[PDB]
Every structure is written in structure tokens, then in C-alpha cells.
Design a protein around this nucleic acid. Structure first.
Ligand SMILES: Nc1nc2c(ncn2[C@@H]2O[C@H](COP(=O)(O)OP(=O)(O)OP(=O)(O)O)[C@@H](O)[C@H]2O)c(=O)[nH]1
Ligand SMILES: Nc1nc2c(ncn2[C@@H]2O[C@H](COP(=O)(O)OP(=O)(O)OP(=O)(O)O)[C@@H](O)[C@H]2O)c(=O)[nH]1
Ligand SMILES: Nc1ncnc2c1ncn2[C@@H]1O[C@H](COP(=O)(O)OP(=O)(O)OP(=O)(O)O)[C@@H](O)[C@H]1O
Ligand SMILES: Nc1ncnc2c1ncn2[C@@H]1O[C@H](COP(=O)(O)OP(=O)(O)OP(=O)(O)O)[C@@H](O)[C@H]1O
Ligand SMILES: [Mg+2]
Ligand SMILES: [Mg+2]
Ligand SMILES: [Zn+2]
Ligand SMILES: [Zn+2]
Lengths: 349, 347
DNA sequence: ATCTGTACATGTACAGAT
DNA sequence: ATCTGTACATGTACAGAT
DNA sequence: ATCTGTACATGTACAGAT
DNA sequence: ATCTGTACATGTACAGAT
């Protein structure tokens, strides 16, 4: 019971999955063909599906989809922004119209990308779909879809580089004692990605490891058979779902928590999965203890004001410059409260 | 243990590895380039290193290397040869036209041209002392005999590469689901399969690339034998068993029918029967070797050792190995087992 | 002038050597 | 314990080709 | 270059078994 | 209550064709 029943509630319905995906795939496919069918500065982008729905940890409803349109760009030089670790300027075609002083401007290229999508969305007459107003500094072009429910799709332009990952990641991805050195070496043989976030704030990109995280979510055990048809279930994803849910419920209720996001939870459980690598440490019979030790770890992160980017160890997602101490102390109070009272926020609608 | 000292004996020396590999890689590279010449039928053939040396289970000396020269052959149809599971006929200005006889790609015609080219190229090698061994009938290999002073064999194996789905005779093979798992199994079966020459148009399936992967990714835990994981004794047990057979085989001509692939197949089944890394703790080397010996003896006595990839192919069937050959090896193994392995002290 | 099969450049798991 | 040679995967440079 | 075909992973859904 | 077996559904890798 208890947490088992909560997970029963969070579980997506097969029918809703079917109806959401088919409408999502209609729009995405149409947008994707537009990007190459034309001259178009983004001819050659490929679709990369990412985030919780494609990692099978989406909760409640299939109402948010994350898609990367990635562009392979060769002979790119990276300059780390302000020792931040995650933010870079990039330098040396149709992309000529996006540079400046030899700097590929994230802002300029996102704007044309965005302009294309808006135009194509205008030609869609079979689906009720609009482009959400732009959020400054965001990497996303966000679609809002109606019909069987509200659905949002974040279309994320990404650059794809095939060289060695930037030195700031050298000490990241510390999976050696959990997924192992062969897996780590192979993952770092994959490309890395750059996403037009902006900390020259307008020209900066941010590193993305959404492809690495997806692999990890679907290949998460120390045993190769974890959660496979001839292995045993673990409760790793279910703990992620529960913690995601506690934060979503807390964020709905308290504006004091706007600065928090699900990626903070994702980052925290990557660290917990590294600290507790054995699959037996995530036995489904120990769901409550597992959820609790995740809570305690997350609270220790808040208390110490320290949650390092799992791929970029020096980039503290909980630094003062990013999240006010007051916000972190508010979230500590609310989590400790739910914890010490049987999670009442889990009962509510 | 006694067995740890045997393993020290069996361990290859780096100095020997260097000298052997340097010469082997010179000859192989030159043979691969000549294959890409002109109107050579084998142009586009690619190199695949296989077998015990590339699996790090070669014992005693680095004196036998296995290398496949693989040729992608698109658009092919296979006919299983008489329900044997492992043997096939292959059918379709193509450069393999000279090897056809009405739809059918002749194995020995292709192997013979392959061989002729190799022999010719070896004649032009004066860098080092290397000759081509007399052909063994029905063998897929062209064997090089290198004297580096020390003697080194190189089996060069012509291979057809097909990228379609594996033949149905393997549908139930590779039973690694409780051990390496379903994702690993699916991904391995997405790789190509291989046909090597074995009546004269018969080819044989090869899974040397899959076996190589398994050898180097052999644990249920991803960290098995890794620098942040725990050592197992799976490969060490393979080495000891290979050594038992090699010592016996160089002493007793009665054992000519047996080869090391029998030992490699038996321990794949053992690795399937005991998937947990803790059933191969280095502290239990003796038990682990002993249970392998016992499994092998039961295969001998019951006359049943299924091909790991082709379940219906029995490597210990009557048609391949006489019951007396099996009973002879059984006695010799049982003898070594119950007398402290005196053949391990030999030489 | 650009294109490209061939081979160099880089990085590291494995396992022998010290 | 760290150091180190071979094998091998992938990214890239460029003589020689087009 | 783009697209379908095949195979089976990952899921949800529910009845019958335990 | 949970487990197991079948049915149902989407996502994804890659072969082969055009
Ligand atoms: C895939 N999607 C991404 C990535 N980064 C951002 N997104 C999408 O873009 C949305 C907004 O990105 P955020 O990182 O939140 O950036 P922001 O909104 O400008 O800044 P915040 O206030 O931190 O939310 C995310 O919720 C994702 O849906 C990525 O690396 N891969
Ligand atoms: C790589 N090398 C192979 C393969 N098959 C055979 N070889 C090499 O070629 C040698 C001869 O193969 P065998 O199976 O012994 O052929 P054979 O001796 O004619 O037939 P048998 O009497 O059954 O031994 C082997 O010892 C290997 O070195 C293969 O599938 N992959
Ligand atoms: N600040 C960030 N830094 C790096 N990558 C991020 C960041 N925020 C999001 N991402 C990446 O983008 C993906 C999609 O983000 P999103 O906000 O939709 O979360 P999610 O993982 O899909 O979960 P959910 O949608 O269920 O809240 C994340 O899974 C992660 O890979
Ligand atoms: N009878 C066979 N059937 C199928 N594949 C075989 C057979 N014999 C050998 N092979 C394959 O060819 C490879 C090379 O064969 P080889 O006889 O050299 O043995 P090995 O595994 O390299 O060991 P060693 O050379 O130390 O005896 C094997 O590893 C196996 O994959
Ligand atoms: Mg999301
Ligand atoms: Mg060999
Ligand atoms: Zn699991
Ligand atoms: Zn091991």
C-alpha cells in the first residue's frame, strides 16, 4: 500500500499514451521535414527523443514531450564561458547568417529556428496547436496542443559535436563502480550537445547530456538483467517518480519554489544511484526505505547548498547565484513536513 | 593454490607478445592490402581478429593467432544443408561470378582462389621466414607458419559476412538471457553473421565475433574484472581446461577428434548454468574448475554437447566422435582429477 | 579547385611487469 | 600499488585522384 | 537522401494463480 | 494482497530498397 498506491495513481494510461503520441508525432514529423525540405539553415537536423516520457518516468499524464533537433557541425572551437563549466561560446554555409565576431550566436540561430517553426505551425489545420510565447534565455520552442488534453512539446535545437567532451566533464559521469569503465568510455565516445540557453549572454550555449541520461535510465542496474524479463525488478525508477511527484505537488502549491525543477530531482538520484550502486540496494520490497534515503540525500543537498551537475562536477546547481538560500530553506521545511507526516500532499488532487 | 601456480606457468610474457604480434601484424597487414588490389575478387575484405589470443585466454605462448578476412556479400539466400543447423548452401559483372555454378557459390572454389593469392603474396615476403602450411581437406583456413625463430601459426579464415537476421537454426541458441540479458542478446543478434568454408559448396556458420564479445563482457555485473569491480575466475577456469586438453592431446593421438572449441562451448553452458559472478569467485578456483570438469565429463559420457549458438548441432554426436574416443578422454580426465593433475607438471 | 580511401591521432580497457 | 605495451574504436588529415 | 520492414526493448491492462 | 501469462501499445536500431 501507501507508496504502491501513489505509484498506481501516477501510472500513465495506455489509451492516453496512444492518443498523445500520435498527435505529437504528427506535429514533430511535419516540423522535422520542414527543417531540411527547403534550403533552410538547419538542413540535416535529426530527431532525438529525450526526457521523462522517453525514459518511462513521466508521471500522471503524457502531457509534456522533449525533442531535440540536432545539427552536426564540424570544426567548432569551444571557449568556456566564465569558468561555469556548462556554458560555452562556439566559433569556426547557411549558418553564416548566425555568426558575429566569428561567434555562433545562440540567440540569432534560435530565432530563425523559432521563426521557421512558427510559420509551419501556421500551416497546420488538422490539429489545435500553437507556439507558446517565448521565455527569454530559454533553449526551447514550446508547442501547446489541445484535443484529448493539454500537451506541451519542447522542441530543442542542439548542436552536435563529435570531438572529445570538454575538459569540464573529465571528472563527471562517475559511474565506474556502478555501470563500469567500459560503459563510461563508450558513453564518452558518443557526441556531446550544445543547447541555446544563455547564461556575451546572448551568444552562449549550454551542454546537454540528454542522450547520456536516457541511456542511463534504460541501462541503470549494476546487473545487466535489472528490470529485464529474465531479471529482477528494482525500484530505482519508482523512487524517481515519487520524488518527481513530491516536487510537482509542492511546486503547484508554493510559488516560493519556482526556482526548482525536475532536473534537480533527476540530478540528485543520479548521485544516489552512484552512491548505492548495488541493485539489491533498490529492491522493490524496500521502496519506502529507498524513497526515504533519497529524501534525506536531497535534504542534505539543500542544507549544504550543493547539488553538482552529474556530468560537470564544478557546476553547482544549488549555488547561491542560482537559488536563494531562502528558497532552499523553504523547500527543506516543506519536505521535512511531508516526510514526518506520511506525505499528505500525496493524497490531494 | 596449486592452480594459481599453473596459471602463472600459462601466463604469456609481454616480451613474447611484442615480438609475435609485431611479425604477425606485418604479414597480416600485407596480405590484407594485396586482397584490395586490382580486379581481386576479395577487394573490400576486412580484418576481424578472433580466437583465444584476442580473448586473452591464449595459454603458454603466443604461437597461434586467428584472423578472419570477411567479405560482405549482399543479397544472398541460404539453404540449410540436410537439417544439420550449422551447414549451408549459398545462392543469389559480380566479382564472385568465377566461383558460381548455377546460383550456388562454391566454397572450395572461392577458398582455392583465396589460397592461391595468399601463397603468391607470401612468396614475395623476404622480411621474415613465413610459409603456407599444406592444406587440410575440408578446413576453412589458410595457415601461415612463421619462424620468428620461435614457431607461430596464423589461421587466416575467409568469411562471408551477411547482415540479415541470423538463420532460424540459431533462434534458440545464445541463451544468455538470465546472465548477460535480453538487451545484450538483442544487440548481439543485430550484428552480422559469418559463413566459413567447410560437399564442396558447403559453408559453416561462425560466431567468433559474438564469442569474442562474450569473453570480454562475461559477467552479470558490468564491473566484472574491471578496475572498479571484482575479479572473477571465469577466464582462469577456461585456461586451466584448455591446458588440460592441450597436454592430453599432445600425448595421446586417441584424442585427435577433440579440440579447444569443445572446451569453449562447455564453459559457455557452464557460464549460463551459473550466471552469478559470486559463483566464480577467485577464492573458489578449485571448485569452479572441478565443477567444469564434472560438467564436461557428463557431456562426454552422455554424448551431448550442444553448439552454444546452434542448439540442434551436437558436437559430441556419434557421427563426429566415436564413443570410445569419448570414454578414453573421460578416463584420462577422471584420472587427472583424482591424482592432483600430474599432467599439469609435465614438460 | 574539391574529393576521398587510407592511415594517423587520441584515449583507454586489459593484463603483464615492476 | 603504479607503470606500460597491445588491441581497438572513432575522429580526422591529406596525397593522390577526379 | 528518405522511407518502410523487422525485431524486441520498454511500457500498460487484466484474468487466473498463488 | 501479490505474481504470472497473455494481449496490447509505442519507441528505436538498423537492413535494405528506392
Ligand atoms: C532536452 N531538452 C532540454 C534541454 N535543456 C532544456 N530543455 C527543455 O527546455 C526547457 C526549459 O529549459 P531550462 O533549462 O528550464 O531553461 P530556462 O527556462 O531558460 O531556465 P530555468 O529558469 O532554469 O527553467 C526544459 O524544461 C526542457 O523541456 C536539454 O539539454 N535536452
Ligand atoms: C575463426 N576461425 C576459425 C573458424 N572456424 C575454423 N577456424 C580456424 O580454422 C581452424 C580449422 O577449423 P576446424 O573446425 O578445426 O576445421 P577442420 O580441422 O578441417 O575440421 P575438424 O575436423 O572438425 O577440426 C581452426 O582451428 C581455427 O583456427 C571460425 O569460425 N572463426
Ligand atoms: N538545467 C538543465 N541542464 C541540463 N539539462 C537539462 C536541464 N533541464 C533539463 N535538461 C534536460 O532536458 C530534459 C527535459 O527536461 P524537462 O524539464 O522536460 O524534464 P524531464 O526529465 O523530461 O521531466 P518532466 O518533464 O517529467 O518534469 C531533461 O530530462 C534533461 O536531460
Ligand atoms: N568446430 C568449430 N565450430 C565453430 N567455430 C569454431 C570451430 N573451431 C573453431 N571455431 C572458431 O574459431 C576460433 C579459432 O579456433 P582455434 O582452434 O584457434 O581456437 P581458439 O579459441 O583460438 O583457441 P586455441 O587457439 O588457444 O586453441 C574459435 O575461437 C571459434 O570461435
Ligand atoms: Mg519533460
Ligand atoms: Mg586459436
Ligand atoms: Zn532496474
Ligand atoms: Zn570477470
Amino acid at each position: 500500500d501507501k507508496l504502491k498506491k501513489v505509484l498506481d495513481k501516477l501510472r500513465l494510461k495506455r489509451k492516453d499514451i496512444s492518443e498523445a503520441a500520435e498527435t505529437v508525432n504528427k506535429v514533430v514529423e511535419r516540423l522535422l521535414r520542414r527543417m531540411q525540405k527547403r534550403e533552410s539553415e538547419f538542413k540535416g537536423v535529426e530527431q532525438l527523443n529525450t526526457g521523462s516520457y522517453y525514459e518511462h518516468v513521466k508521471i500522471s499524464a503524457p502531457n509534456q514531450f522533449n525533442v531535440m533537433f540536432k545539427l552536426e557541425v564540424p570544426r567548432i572551437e569551444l571557449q568556456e564561458y566564465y569558468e561555469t563549466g556548462a556554458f560555452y561560446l562556439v566559433k569556426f554555409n547557411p549558418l553564416s547568417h548566425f555568426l558575429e565576431g566569428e561567434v555562433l550566436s545562440a540567440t540569432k540561430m534560435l530565432s530563425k529556428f523559432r521563426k521557421i517553426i512558427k510559420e509551419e505551425v501556421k500551416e497546420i489545420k488538422d490539429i489545435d496547436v500553437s507556439v507558446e510565447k517565448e521565455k527569454p534565455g530559454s533553449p526551447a520552442v514550446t508547442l501547446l496542443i489541445r484535443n484529448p488534453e493539454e500537451i506541451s512539446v519542447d522542441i530543442i535545437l542542439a548542436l552536435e559535436s563529435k570531438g572529445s567532451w570538454p575538459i569540464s566533464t573529465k571528472e563527471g559521469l562517475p559511474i565506474q563502480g556502478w555501470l563500469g569503465t567500459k560503459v563510461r568510455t563508450n558513453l564518452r565516445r558518443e557526441p556531446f550537445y550544445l543547447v541555446p540557453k544563455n547564461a556575451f549572454q546572448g551568444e552562449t550555449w549550454r551542454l546537454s547530456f540528454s542522450h547520456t541520461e536516457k541511456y542511463i535510465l534504460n541501462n541503470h542496474g549494476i546487473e545487466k538483467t535489472c528490470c529485464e524479463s529474465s531479471g529482477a525488478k528494482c525500484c530505482r525508477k519508482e523512487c524517481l517518480k515519487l520524488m518527481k511527484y513530491l516536487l510537482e505537488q509542492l511546486k503547484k502549491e508554493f510559488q516560493e519554489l519556482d526556482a526548482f525543477c525536475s532536473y534537480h530531482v533527476k540530478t540528485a538520484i543520479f548521485h544516489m544511484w552512484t552512491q548505492d550502486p548495488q541493485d539489491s540496494q533498490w529492491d522493490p520490497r524496500n521502496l519506502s526505505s529507498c524513497f526515504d534515503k533519497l529524501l534525506a540525500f536531497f535534504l542534505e543537498c539543500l542544507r549544504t547548498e550543493k547539488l553538482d551537475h552529474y556530468f560537470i562536477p564544478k557546476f553547482n546547481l544549488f549555488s547561491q547565484e542560482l537559488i536563494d538560500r531562502k528558497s532552499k530553506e523553504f523547500l527543506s521545511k516543506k519536505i521535512e513536513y511531508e516526510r514526518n507526516n506520511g506525505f499528505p500532499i500525496f493524497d490531494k488532487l
